[PDB]
Amino acid sequence: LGSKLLVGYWHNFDNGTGIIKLKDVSPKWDVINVSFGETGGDRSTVEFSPVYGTDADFKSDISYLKSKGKKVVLSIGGQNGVVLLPDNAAKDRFINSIQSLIDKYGFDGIDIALESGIYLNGNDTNFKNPTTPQIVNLISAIRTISDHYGPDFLLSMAPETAYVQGGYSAYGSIWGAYLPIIYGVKDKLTYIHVQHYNAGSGIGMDGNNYNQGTADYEVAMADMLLHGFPVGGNANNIFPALRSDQVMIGLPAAPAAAPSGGYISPTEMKKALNYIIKGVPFGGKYKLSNQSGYPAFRGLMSWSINWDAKNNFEFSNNYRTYFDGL
Ligand SMILES: CC(=O)N[C@@H]1[C@@H](O)[C@H](O[C@@H]2O[C@H](CO)[C@@H](O)[C@H](O)[C@H]2NC(C)=O)[C@@H](CO)O[C@H]1O
C-alpha cells in the first residue's frame, strides 16, 4: 500500500450518477470501497450481490484490479447496512458472513461505515474498556476478521465527526462512540477516514469553532487524530494519537456529493494538505500541533468515485497530481 492514497467509494447501485464497471474506474484511485454490504431481517448476516456481472465476472474484475496494484474493499454501511450485534450469536453471524463474502469475491479488506446501534450506554465511560455490547462485539468481530486474513488485510472505517472528534466535547450516546472502536482495533487499523462533510461545524483542540468545507476545519479535525486529545472535558482522559499513516480525511468529490455541505475546493484543500503534511501554513486561524508537519499523513478518501466521474474527475485529477508532486 502506497504512502499517499486516494480511497474512493464505489456505488454498487445507481443513484442517478450511473454505474461504473470496475475496469472503467480511473486508475488514479488506489483503493476502491465497494458500497455496500447490507443486512436483512436479522441485522447481522451481511449480504452482497454485484450490481452488474455474474459472480464470476465481478470476481474476475476484482482480480484484474488487484493485479494492477489496486485494493478492493467491502464497505459495510449505508441505509441498508444496519448492523446490530447485541449478543455473541449476532456477532458470529456477522463474522461468518463477512468472511464468506471476502472468500467469495476476493476482497482485499473491509471498511466499517456503520452507525446503527453505535451509542455509548450509560456507564460506558472508558474508551480503553468499553461495556456497550454493540461496541464490544463490533471490536471483537473486527479483530477476529482481521486475524483471519493477517496484516496484509486492509481495515478502514468512516465514522461521522461526532463519533470521533465529538469526543472532545462529550463522551456518551453517539458522542465519542467510535473512540473505543478505534482504540480497540488500532493495531489492526490500516487507516481511518472520518467524514469531514454533512458535518456543520466542529470544535478544534484550540477550543475554536470551525466551519466544514474550510481549510482550517480540515486541519483542526485531522489534528485531533494526529496529536490525540482530552476526552469529554477531562484533562486526565487523553485519547492517544494514531500513527500519521493511519490518518486520512474523507471529502465529498463534488458539491452535490454531500447535499448538507462539506465540499472544499482543491485550491483550499491543498493549503490544508501542505500544512498537515509539511507544516507550511497558509494564514489560517488554526495552529497545527506539530511545528513542521506530519509527513506520513496517509491521504484522502472521497464519496465517491461515481460522483467524481460526474464532476469532470476534479477530485481524482487534482489530488493525484498534488500527492504525486510530494
Ligand atoms: C460510507 C458512507 O457512509 N457513505 C455515505 C453515503 O451513504 C451517502 O451517500 C448516499 O448513499 C445512499 C446509500 O447509502 C444513497 O442512496 C444516496 O443516493 C447517496 N447520496 C448521495 C448524495 O450520493 C453520502 C451522502 O453525502 O455520505 C457518505 O459518506
Side-chain angles (χ1 to χ4, degrees), residues 9 11 13-17 35-36 38 75-80 111-114 158 160 195 197-198 252 256-260 301 303-304 307:
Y9 283 87
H11 302 176
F13 55 85
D14 189 357
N15 71 347
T17 58
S35 307
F36 291 105
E38 308 178 328
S75 179
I76 299 109
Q79 55 194 53
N80 296 143
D111 172 65
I112 305 299
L114 63 95
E160 298 175 80
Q195 305 176 33
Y197 52 88
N198 304 313
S260 296
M301 168 278 267
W303 186 263
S304 56
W307 273 112

PDB file of all heavy atoms in Angstrom, residues 9 11 13-17 35-36 38 75-80 111-114 158 160 195 197-198 252 256-260 301 303-304 307, ligand 1:
ATOM      1  N   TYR A   9     -15.047   5.584  -2.656  1.00  0.00           N
ATOM      2  CA  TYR A   9     -16.236   4.744  -2.591  1.00  0.00           C
ATOM      3  C   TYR A   9     -16.816   4.507  -3.979  1.00  0.00           C
ATOM      4  O   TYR A   9     -16.862   5.413  -4.815  1.00  0.00           O
ATOM      5  CB  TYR A   9     -17.287   5.355  -1.666  1.00  0.00           C
ATOM      6  CG  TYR A   9     -16.944   5.157  -0.209  1.00  0.00           C
ATOM      7  CD1 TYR A   9     -16.126   6.062   0.461  1.00  0.00           C
ATOM      8  CD2 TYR A   9     -17.416   4.047   0.488  1.00  0.00           C
ATOM      9  CE1 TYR A   9     -15.800   5.871   1.812  1.00  0.00           C
ATOM     10  CE2 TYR A   9     -17.088   3.841   1.824  1.00  0.00           C
ATOM     11  CZ  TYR A   9     -16.292   4.757   2.482  1.00  0.00           C
ATOM     12  OH  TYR A   9     -15.988   4.542   3.812  1.00  0.00           O
ATOM     13  N   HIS A  11     -20.145   3.000  -6.044  1.00  0.00           N
ATOM     14  CA  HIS A  11     -21.570   2.702  -5.870  1.00  0.00           C
ATOM     15  C   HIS A  11     -21.963   1.354  -6.464  1.00  0.00           C
ATOM     16  O   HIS A  11     -21.929   1.175  -7.681  1.00  0.00           O
ATOM     17  CB  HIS A  11     -22.471   3.757  -6.539  1.00  0.00           C
ATOM     18  CG  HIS A  11     -22.260   5.167  -6.067  1.00  0.00           C
ATOM     19  ND1 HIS A  11     -22.928   6.231  -6.633  1.00  0.00           N
ATOM     20  CD2 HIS A  11     -21.461   5.693  -5.106  1.00  0.00           C
ATOM     21  CE1 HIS A  11     -22.555   7.352  -6.039  1.00  0.00           C
ATOM     22  NE2 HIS A  11     -21.668   7.053  -5.108  1.00  0.00           N
ATOM     23  N   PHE A  13     -24.764   0.434  -7.041  1.00  0.00           N
ATOM     24  CA  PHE A  13     -26.134   0.895  -7.224  1.00  0.00           C
ATOM     25  C   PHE A  13     -26.108   2.116  -8.124  1.00  0.00           C
ATOM     26  O   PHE A  13     -25.051   2.722  -8.321  1.00  0.00           O
ATOM     27  CB  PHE A  13     -26.783   1.250  -5.876  1.00  0.00           C
ATOM     28  CG  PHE A  13     -26.005   2.263  -5.056  1.00  0.00           C
ATOM     29  CD1 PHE A  13     -26.164   3.623  -5.268  1.00  0.00           C
ATOM     30  CD2 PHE A  13     -25.142   1.846  -4.051  1.00  0.00           C
ATOM     31  CE1 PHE A  13     -25.462   4.548  -4.511  1.00  0.00           C
ATOM     32  CE2 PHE A  13     -24.441   2.764  -3.295  1.00  0.00           C
ATOM     33  CZ  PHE A  13     -24.601   4.115  -3.527  1.00  0.00           C
ATOM     34  N   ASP A  14     -27.271   2.477  -8.665  1.00  0.00           N
ATOM     35  CA  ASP A  14     -27.404   3.692  -9.457  1.00  0.00           C
ATOM     36  C   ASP A  14     -28.271   4.700  -8.720  1.00  0.00           C
ATOM     37  O   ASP A  14     -29.479   4.506  -8.583  1.00  0.00           O
ATOM     38  CB  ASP A  14     -28.017   3.372 -10.824  1.00  0.00           C
ATOM     39  CG  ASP A  14     -27.982   4.552 -11.777  1.00  0.00           C
ATOM     40  OD1 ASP A  14     -27.539   5.651 -11.386  1.00  0.00           O
ATOM     41  OD2 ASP A  14     -28.409   4.377 -12.938  1.00  0.00           O
ATOM     42  N   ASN A  15     -27.654   5.766  -8.217  1.00  0.00           N
ATOM     43  CA  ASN A  15     -28.416   6.819  -7.565  1.00  0.00           C
ATOM     44  C   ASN A  15     -28.623   8.028  -8.470  1.00  0.00           C
ATOM     45  O   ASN A  15     -28.943   9.120  -7.994  1.00  0.00           O
ATOM     46  CB  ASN A  15     -27.759   7.242  -6.249  1.00  0.00           C
ATOM     47  CG  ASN A  15     -26.468   8.003  -6.459  1.00  0.00           C
ATOM     48  OD1 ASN A  15     -25.912   8.022  -7.557  1.00  0.00           O
ATOM     49  ND2 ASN A  15     -25.979   8.638  -5.395  1.00  0.00           N
ATOM     50  N   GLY A  16     -28.449   7.828  -9.773  1.00  0.00           N
ATOM     51  CA  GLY A  16     -28.539   8.923 -10.728  1.00  0.00           C
ATOM     52  C   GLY A  16     -27.188   9.316 -11.299  1.00  0.00           C
ATOM     53  O   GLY A  16     -27.113  10.000 -12.321  1.00  0.00           O
ATOM     54  N   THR A  17     -26.114   8.888 -10.641  1.00  0.00           N
ATOM     55  CA  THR A  17     -24.761   9.177 -11.122  1.00  0.00           C
ATOM     56  C   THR A  17     -24.237   8.063 -12.024  1.00  0.00           C
ATOM     57  O   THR A  17     -23.158   8.177 -12.597  1.00  0.00           O
ATOM     58  CB  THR A  17     -23.755   9.392  -9.968  1.00  0.00           C
ATOM     59  OG1 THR A  17     -23.722   8.231  -9.126  1.00  0.00           O
ATOM     60  CG2 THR A  17     -24.138  10.604  -9.148  1.00  0.00           C
ATOM     61  N   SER A  35     -19.594  -0.326  -2.248  1.00  0.00           N
ATOM     62  CA  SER A  35     -20.665   0.173  -1.382  1.00  0.00           C
ATOM     63  C   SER A  35     -22.050  -0.361  -1.780  1.00  0.00           C
ATOM     64  O   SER A  35     -22.579   0.059  -2.801  1.00  0.00           O
ATOM     65  CB  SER A  35     -20.683   1.700  -1.477  1.00  0.00           C
ATOM     66  OG  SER A  35     -19.398   2.245  -1.212  1.00  0.00           O
ATOM     67  N   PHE A  36     -22.674  -1.232  -0.982  1.00  0.00           N
ATOM     68  CA  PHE A  36     -22.237  -1.627   0.348  1.00  0.00           C
ATOM     69  C   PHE A  36     -22.631  -3.076   0.599  1.00  0.00           C
ATOM     70  O   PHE A  36     -23.538  -3.602  -0.050  1.00  0.00           O
ATOM     71  CB  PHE A  36     -23.008  -0.829   1.392  1.00  0.00           C
ATOM     72  CG  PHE A  36     -22.672   0.633   1.438  1.00  0.00           C
ATOM     73  CD1 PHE A  36     -23.546   1.577   0.919  1.00  0.00           C
ATOM     74  CD2 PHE A  36     -21.502   1.065   2.043  1.00  0.00           C
ATOM     75  CE1 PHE A  36     -23.248   2.932   0.986  1.00  0.00           C
ATOM     76  CE2 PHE A  36     -21.198   2.414   2.113  1.00  0.00           C
ATOM     77  CZ  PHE A  36     -22.072   3.347   1.584  1.00  0.00           C
ATOM     78  N   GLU A  38     -24.802  -5.318   2.931  1.00  0.00           N
ATOM     79  CA  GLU A  38     -26.019  -4.971   3.658  1.00  0.00           C
ATOM     80  C   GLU A  38     -26.578  -6.152   4.434  1.00  0.00           C
ATOM     81  O   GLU A  38     -26.121  -7.278   4.273  1.00  0.00           O
ATOM     82  CB  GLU A  38     -27.064  -4.437   2.685  1.00  0.00           C
ATOM     83  CG  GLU A  38     -26.522  -3.324   1.810  1.00  0.00           C
ATOM     84  CD  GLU A  38     -27.528  -2.818   0.806  1.00  0.00           C
ATOM     85  OE1 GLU A  38     -28.369  -3.620   0.348  1.00  0.00           O
ATOM     86  OE2 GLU A  38     -27.471  -1.614   0.470  1.00  0.00           O
ATOM     87  N   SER A  75     -17.233  -2.299   1.818  1.00  0.00           N
ATOM     88  CA  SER A  75     -17.683  -1.361   2.843  1.00  0.00           C
ATOM     89  C   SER A  75     -19.014  -1.806   3.426  1.00  0.00           C
ATOM     90  O   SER A  75     -19.947  -2.117   2.689  1.00  0.00           O
ATOM     91  CB  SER A  75     -17.828   0.046   2.267  1.00  0.00           C
ATOM     92  OG  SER A  75     -18.285   0.948   3.260  1.00  0.00           O
ATOM     93  N   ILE A  76     -19.100  -1.824   4.750  1.00  0.00           N
ATOM     94  CA  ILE A  76     -20.329  -2.203   5.424  1.00  0.00           C
ATOM     95  C   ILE A  76     -20.985  -0.941   5.979  1.00  0.00           C
ATOM     96  O   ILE A  76     -20.414  -0.260   6.832  1.00  0.00           O
ATOM     97  CB  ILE A  76     -20.075  -3.223   6.558  1.00  0.00           C
ATOM     98  CG1 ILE A  76     -19.461  -4.508   5.999  1.00  0.00           C
ATOM     99  CG2 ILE A  76     -21.371  -3.562   7.271  1.00  0.00           C
ATOM    100  CD1 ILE A  76     -18.017  -4.710   6.372  1.00  0.00           C
ATOM    101  N   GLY A  77     -22.176  -0.622   5.477  1.00  0.00           N
ATOM    102  CA  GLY A  77     -22.860   0.604   5.869  1.00  0.00           C
ATOM    103  C   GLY A  77     -23.919   1.037   4.868  1.00  0.00           C
ATOM    104  O   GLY A  77     -24.487   0.214   4.154  1.00  0.00           O
ATOM    105  N   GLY A  78     -24.187   2.335   4.815  1.00  0.00           N
ATOM    106  CA  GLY A  78     -25.292   2.842   4.009  1.00  0.00           C
ATOM    107  C   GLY A  78     -26.625   2.535   4.674  1.00  0.00           C
ATOM    108  O   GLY A  78     -26.684   1.822   5.683  1.00  0.00           O
ATOM    109  N   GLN A  79     -27.705   3.065   4.110  1.00  0.00           N
ATOM    110  CA  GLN A  79     -29.012   2.928   4.740  1.00  0.00           C
ATOM    111  C   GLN A  79     -29.397   1.475   5.043  1.00  0.00           C
ATOM    112  O   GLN A  79     -30.121   1.222   6.004  1.00  0.00           O
ATOM    113  CB  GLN A  79     -30.090   3.608   3.898  1.00  0.00           C
ATOM    114  CG  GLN A  79     -30.135   3.130   2.468  1.00  0.00           C
ATOM    115  CD  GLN A  79     -30.973   4.040   1.591  1.00  0.00           C
ATOM    116  OE1 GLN A  79     -30.756   5.252   1.551  1.00  0.00           O
ATOM    117  NE2 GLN A  79     -31.939   3.460   0.884  1.00  0.00           N
ATOM    118  N   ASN A  80     -28.928   0.530   4.228  1.00  0.00           N
ATOM    119  CA  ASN A  80     -29.236  -0.889   4.437  1.00  0.00           C
ATOM    120  C   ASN A  80     -28.150  -1.661   5.180  1.00  0.00           C
ATOM    121  O   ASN A  80     -28.256  -2.878   5.355  1.00  0.00           O
ATOM    122  CB  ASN A  80     -29.533  -1.580   3.103  1.00  0.00           C
ATOM    123  CG  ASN A  80     -30.775  -1.027   2.422  1.00  0.00           C
ATOM    124  OD1 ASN A  80     -30.822  -0.908   1.197  1.00  0.00           O
ATOM    125  ND2 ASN A  80     -31.787  -0.689   3.213  1.00  0.00           N
ATOM    126  N   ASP A 111     -14.289  -2.125   5.141  1.00  0.00           N
ATOM    127  CA  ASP A 111     -14.419  -0.751   5.578  1.00  0.00           C
ATOM    128  C   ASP A 111     -15.650  -0.684   6.461  1.00  0.00           C
ATOM    129  O   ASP A 111     -16.739  -1.089   6.049  1.00  0.00           O
ATOM    130  CB  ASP A 111     -14.613   0.172   4.370  1.00  0.00           C
ATOM    131  CG  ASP A 111     -14.958   1.592   4.769  1.00  0.00           C
ATOM    132  OD1 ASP A 111     -14.112   2.258   5.400  1.00  0.00           O
ATOM    133  OD2 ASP A 111     -16.071   2.053   4.434  1.00  0.00           O
ATOM    134  N   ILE A 112     -15.470  -0.185   7.678  1.00  0.00           N
ATOM    135  CA  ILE A 112     -16.568  -0.100   8.628  1.00  0.00           C
ATOM    136  C   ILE A 112     -17.155   1.304   8.607  1.00  0.00           C
ATOM    137  O   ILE A 112     -16.526   2.257   9.068  1.00  0.00           O
ATOM    138  CB  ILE A 112     -16.099  -0.433  10.056  1.00  0.00           C
ATOM    139  CG1 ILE A 112     -15.412  -1.807  10.092  1.00  0.00           C
ATOM    140  CG2 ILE A 112     -17.268  -0.350  11.038  1.00  0.00           C
ATOM    141  CD1 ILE A 112     -16.308  -2.964   9.671  1.00  0.00           C
ATOM    142  N   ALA A 113     -18.360   1.417   8.058  1.00  0.00           N
ATOM    143  CA  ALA A 113     -19.034   2.699   7.929  1.00  0.00           C
ATOM    144  C   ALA A 113     -20.437   2.596   8.501  1.00  0.00           C
ATOM    145  O   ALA A 113     -21.362   3.241   8.012  1.00  0.00           O
ATOM    146  CB  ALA A 113     -19.101   3.111   6.467  1.00  0.00           C
ATOM    147  N   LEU A 114     -20.596   1.776   9.528  1.00  0.00           N
ATOM    148  CA  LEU A 114     -21.906   1.583  10.121  1.00  0.00           C
ATOM    149  C   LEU A 114     -22.021   2.368  11.413  1.00  0.00           C
ATOM    150  O   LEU A 114     -21.071   2.443  12.205  1.00  0.00           O
ATOM    151  CB  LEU A 114     -22.185   0.090  10.341  1.00  0.00           C
ATOM    152  CG  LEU A 114     -21.281  -0.667  11.308  1.00  0.00           C
ATOM    153  CD1 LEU A 114     -21.919  -0.716  12.687  1.00  0.00           C
ATOM    154  CD2 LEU A 114     -20.994  -2.073  10.807  1.00  0.00           C
ATOM    155  N   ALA A 158     -15.102   4.731   8.547  1.00  0.00           N
ATOM    156  CA  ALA A 158     -15.543   6.041   8.069  1.00  0.00           C
ATOM    157  C   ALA A 158     -16.687   6.629   8.894  1.00  0.00           C
ATOM    158  O   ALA A 158     -17.763   6.928   8.364  1.00  0.00           O
ATOM    159  CB  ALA A 158     -15.931   5.965   6.591  1.00  0.00           C
ATOM    160  N   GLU A 160     -18.806   9.437  11.222  1.00  0.00           N
ATOM    161  CA  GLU A 160     -19.004  10.885  11.218  1.00  0.00           C
ATOM    162  C   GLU A 160     -18.243  11.548  12.374  1.00  0.00           C
ATOM    163  O   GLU A 160     -17.829  10.880  13.330  1.00  0.00           O
ATOM    164  CB  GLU A 160     -20.492  11.230  11.303  1.00  0.00           C
ATOM    165  CG  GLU A 160     -21.315  10.721  10.124  1.00  0.00           C
ATOM    166  CD  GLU A 160     -22.800  10.982  10.305  1.00  0.00           C
ATOM    167  OE1 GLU A 160     -23.246  12.119  10.048  1.00  0.00           O
ATOM    168  OE2 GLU A 160     -23.525  10.051  10.708  1.00  0.00           O
ATOM    169  N   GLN A 195     -15.641  11.286   8.059  1.00  0.00           N
ATOM    170  CA  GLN A 195     -16.357  12.062   7.039  1.00  0.00           C
ATOM    171  C   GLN A 195     -16.385  13.551   7.392  1.00  0.00           C
ATOM    172  O   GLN A 195     -17.181  13.986   8.227  1.00  0.00           O
ATOM    173  CB  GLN A 195     -17.785  11.536   6.855  1.00  0.00           C
ATOM    174  CG  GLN A 195     -17.882  10.053   6.533  1.00  0.00           C
ATOM    175  CD  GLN A 195     -19.321   9.574   6.470  1.00  0.00           C
ATOM    176  OE1 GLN A 195     -20.219  10.316   6.064  1.00  0.00           O
ATOM    177  NE2 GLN A 195     -19.548   8.332   6.879  1.00  0.00           N
ATOM    178  N   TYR A 197     -17.758  16.028   6.270  1.00  0.00           N
ATOM    179  CA  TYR A 197     -18.813  16.638   5.460  1.00  0.00           C
ATOM    180  C   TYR A 197     -20.194  16.251   5.982  1.00  0.00           C
ATOM    181  O   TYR A 197     -20.303  15.367   6.827  1.00  0.00           O
ATOM    182  CB  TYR A 197     -18.638  16.272   3.980  1.00  0.00           C
ATOM    183  CG  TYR A 197     -18.503  14.789   3.720  1.00  0.00           C
ATOM    184  CD1 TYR A 197     -19.625  13.997   3.512  1.00  0.00           C
ATOM    185  CD2 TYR A 197     -17.256  14.176   3.689  1.00  0.00           C
ATOM    186  CE1 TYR A 197     -19.507  12.644   3.279  1.00  0.00           C
ATOM    187  CE2 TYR A 197     -17.126  12.825   3.459  1.00  0.00           C
ATOM    188  CZ  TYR A 197     -18.255  12.062   3.249  1.00  0.00           C
ATOM    189  OH  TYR A 197     -18.134  10.711   3.025  1.00  0.00           O
ATOM    190  N   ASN A 198     -21.239  16.913   5.482  1.00  0.00           N
ATOM    191  CA  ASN A 198     -22.558  16.864   6.135  1.00  0.00           C
ATOM    192  C   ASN A 198     -22.387  17.034   7.653  1.00  0.00           C
ATOM    193  O   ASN A 198     -23.064  16.379   8.452  1.00  0.00           O
ATOM    194  CB  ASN A 198     -23.300  15.554   5.808  1.00  0.00           C
ATOM    195  CG  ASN A 198     -23.455  15.313   4.310  1.00  0.00           C
ATOM    196  OD1 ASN A 198     -23.850  16.204   3.550  1.00  0.00           O
ATOM    197  ND2 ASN A 198     -23.163  14.089   3.882  1.00  0.00           N
ATOM    198  N   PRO A 252     -16.245  15.124   0.168  1.00  0.00           N
ATOM    199  CA  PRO A 252     -17.128  14.953  -0.987  1.00  0.00           C
ATOM    200  C   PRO A 252     -16.377  15.205  -2.300  1.00  0.00           C
ATOM    201  O   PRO A 252     -15.595  16.149  -2.393  1.00  0.00           O
ATOM    202  CB  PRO A 252     -18.187  16.046  -0.789  1.00  0.00           C
ATOM    203  CG  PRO A 252     -18.045  16.492   0.649  1.00  0.00           C
ATOM    204  CD  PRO A 252     -16.585  16.328   0.943  1.00  0.00           C
ATOM    205  N   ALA A 256     -22.417  18.399  -4.860  1.00  0.00           N
ATOM    206  CA  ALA A 256     -23.647  17.604  -4.732  1.00  0.00           C
ATOM    207  C   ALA A 256     -23.446  16.244  -4.055  1.00  0.00           C
ATOM    208  O   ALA A 256     -24.418  15.572  -3.701  1.00  0.00           O
ATOM    209  CB  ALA A 256     -24.312  17.423  -6.097  1.00  0.00           C
ATOM    210  N   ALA A 257     -22.194  15.834  -3.885  1.00  0.00           N
ATOM    211  CA  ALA A 257     -21.905  14.547  -3.263  1.00  0.00           C
ATOM    212  C   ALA A 257     -22.245  14.566  -1.776  1.00  0.00           C
ATOM    213  O   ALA A 257     -22.428  13.512  -1.159  1.00  0.00           O
ATOM    214  CB  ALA A 257     -20.440  14.158  -3.484  1.00  0.00           C
ATOM    215  N   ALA A 258     -22.313  15.767  -1.207  1.00  0.00           N
ATOM    216  CA  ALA A 258     -22.694  15.953   0.194  1.00  0.00           C
ATOM    217  C   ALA A 258     -23.680  17.113   0.276  1.00  0.00           C
ATOM    218  O   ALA A 258     -23.287  18.264   0.460  1.00  0.00           O
ATOM    219  CB  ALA A 258     -21.460  16.220   1.061  1.00  0.00           C
ATOM    220  N   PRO A 259     -24.973  16.811   0.113  1.00  0.00           N
ATOM    221  CA  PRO A 259     -26.014  17.834  -0.008  1.00  0.00           C
ATOM    222  C   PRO A 259     -26.131  18.778   1.182  1.00  0.00           C
ATOM    223  O   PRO A 259     -26.762  19.826   1.053  1.00  0.00           O
ATOM    224  CB  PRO A 259     -27.303  17.015  -0.143  1.00  0.00           C
ATOM    225  CG  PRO A 259     -26.870  15.690  -0.633  1.00  0.00           C
ATOM    226  CD  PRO A 259     -25.506  15.450  -0.065  1.00  0.00           C
ATOM    227  N   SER A 260     -25.564  18.410   2.330  1.00  0.00           N
ATOM    228  CA  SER A 260     -25.656  19.252   3.514  1.00  0.00           C
ATOM    229  C   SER A 260     -24.385  20.065   3.717  1.00  0.00           C
ATOM    230  O   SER A 260     -24.168  20.635   4.788  1.00  0.00           O
ATOM    231  CB  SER A 260     -25.964  18.412   4.757  1.00  0.00           C
ATOM    232  OG  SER A 260     -27.244  17.810   4.631  1.00  0.00           O
ATOM    233  N   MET A 301      -9.843  10.280   1.351  1.00  0.00           N
ATOM    234  CA  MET A 301     -10.947   9.426   0.932  1.00  0.00           C
ATOM    235  C   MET A 301     -12.005  10.312   0.278  1.00  0.00           C
ATOM    236  O   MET A 301     -12.090  11.498   0.579  1.00  0.00           O
ATOM    237  CB  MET A 301     -11.537   8.697   2.151  1.00  0.00           C
ATOM    238  CG  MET A 301     -12.878   7.999   1.920  1.00  0.00           C
ATOM    239  SD  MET A 301     -14.320   9.088   2.030  1.00  0.00           S
ATOM    240  CE  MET A 301     -14.760   8.867   3.763  1.00  0.00           C
ATOM    241  N   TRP A 303     -16.306  10.344  -1.029  1.00  0.00           N
ATOM    242  CA  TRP A 303     -17.594   9.957  -1.573  1.00  0.00           C
ATOM    243  C   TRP A 303     -17.805  10.874  -2.779  1.00  0.00           C
ATOM    244  O   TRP A 303     -18.089  12.058  -2.603  1.00  0.00           O
ATOM    245  CB  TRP A 303     -18.719  10.165  -0.547  1.00  0.00           C
ATOM    246  CG  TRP A 303     -20.022   9.639  -1.046  1.00  0.00           C
ATOM    247  CD1 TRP A 303     -21.029  10.347  -1.643  1.00  0.00           C
ATOM    248  CD2 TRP A 303     -20.438   8.274  -1.040  1.00  0.00           C
ATOM    249  NE1 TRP A 303     -22.056   9.497  -1.996  1.00  0.00           N
ATOM    250  CE2 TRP A 303     -21.718   8.219  -1.629  1.00  0.00           C
ATOM    251  CE3 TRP A 303     -19.855   7.088  -0.573  1.00  0.00           C
ATOM    252  CZ2 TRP A 303     -22.421   7.017  -1.786  1.00  0.00           C
ATOM    253  CZ3 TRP A 303     -20.552   5.900  -0.720  1.00  0.00           C
ATOM    254  CH2 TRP A 303     -21.829   5.874  -1.319  1.00  0.00           C
ATOM    255  N   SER A 304     -17.636  10.370  -4.005  1.00  0.00           N
ATOM    256  CA  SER A 304     -17.320   8.983  -4.310  1.00  0.00           C
ATOM    257  C   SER A 304     -16.678   8.928  -5.699  1.00  0.00           C
ATOM    258  O   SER A 304     -16.602   9.938  -6.402  1.00  0.00           O
ATOM    259  CB  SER A 304     -18.612   8.174  -4.361  1.00  0.00           C
ATOM    260  OG  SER A 304     -19.487   8.764  -5.306  1.00  0.00           O
ATOM    261  N   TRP A 307     -19.433  10.051  -8.153  1.00  0.00           N
ATOM    262  CA  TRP A 307     -19.615  11.495  -8.153  1.00  0.00           C
ATOM    263  C   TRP A 307     -18.447  12.204  -8.835  1.00  0.00           C
ATOM    264  O   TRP A 307     -18.637  13.185  -9.555  1.00  0.00           O
ATOM    265  CB  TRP A 307     -19.801  12.010  -6.728  1.00  0.00           C
ATOM    266  CG  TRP A 307     -21.231  11.970  -6.278  1.00  0.00           C
ATOM    267  CD1 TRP A 307     -21.771  11.163  -5.323  1.00  0.00           C
ATOM    268  CD2 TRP A 307     -22.304  12.773  -6.779  1.00  0.00           C
ATOM    269  NE1 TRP A 307     -23.115  11.422  -5.188  1.00  0.00           N
ATOM    270  CE2 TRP A 307     -23.466  12.409  -6.071  1.00  0.00           C
ATOM    271  CE3 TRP A 307     -22.393  13.772  -7.754  1.00  0.00           C
ATOM    272  CZ2 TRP A 307     -24.702  13.001  -6.312  1.00  0.00           C
ATOM    273  CZ3 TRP A 307     -23.624  14.362  -7.991  1.00  0.00           C
ATOM    274  CH2 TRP A 307     -24.761  13.973  -7.276  1.00  0.00           C
TER     275      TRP A 307
HETATM  276  C1  LIG B   1     -19.602   5.368   3.725  1.00  0.00           C
HETATM  277  C2  LIG B   1     -20.799   6.253   3.857  1.00  0.00           C
HETATM  278  O1  LIG B   1     -21.354   6.373   4.950  1.00  0.00           O
HETATM  279  N1  LIG B   1     -21.197   6.870   2.746  1.00  0.00           N
HETATM  280  C3  LIG B   1     -22.164   7.958   2.748  1.00  0.00           C
HETATM  281  C4  LIG B   1     -23.195   7.719   1.653  1.00  0.00           C
HETATM  282  O2  LIG B   1     -24.047   6.652   2.028  1.00  0.00           O
HETATM  283  C5  LIG B   1     -24.021   8.971   1.340  1.00  0.00           C
HETATM  284  O3  LIG B   1     -24.465   8.908   0.007  1.00  0.00           O
HETATM  285  C6  LIG B   1     -25.785   8.351  -0.131  1.00  0.00           C
HETATM  286  O4  LIG B   1     -25.759   6.945  -0.009  1.00  0.00           O
HETATM  287  C7  LIG B   1     -27.028   6.340  -0.111  1.00  0.00           C
HETATM  288  C8  LIG B   1     -26.859   4.844   0.139  1.00  0.00           C
HETATM  289  O5  LIG B   1     -26.456   4.649   1.475  1.00  0.00           O
HETATM  290  C9  LIG B   1     -27.615   6.620  -1.491  1.00  0.00           C
HETATM  291  O6  LIG B   1     -28.927   6.108  -1.594  1.00  0.00           O
HETATM  292  C10 LIG B   1     -27.671   8.114  -1.767  1.00  0.00           C
HETATM  293  O7  LIG B   1     -28.035   8.303  -3.113  1.00  0.00           O
HETATM  294  C11 LIG B   1     -26.306   8.742  -1.508  1.00  0.00           C
HETATM  295  N2  LIG B   1     -26.358  10.189  -1.651  1.00  0.00           N
HETATM  296  C12 LIG B   1     -25.502  10.832  -2.447  1.00  0.00           C
HETATM  297  C13 LIG B   1     -25.516  12.334  -2.392  1.00  0.00           C
HETATM  298  O8  LIG B   1     -24.723  10.238  -3.192  1.00  0.00           O
HETATM  299  C14 LIG B   1     -23.229  10.275   1.428  1.00  0.00           C
HETATM  300  C15 LIG B   1     -24.184  11.465   1.403  1.00  0.00           C
HETATM  301  O9  LIG B   1     -23.459  12.669   1.286  1.00  0.00           O
HETATM  302  O10 LIG B   1     -22.427  10.316   2.587  1.00  0.00           O
HETATM  303  C16 LIG B   1     -21.465   9.290   2.510  1.00  0.00           C
HETATM  304  O11 LIG B   1     -20.445   9.482   3.461  1.00  0.00           O
END
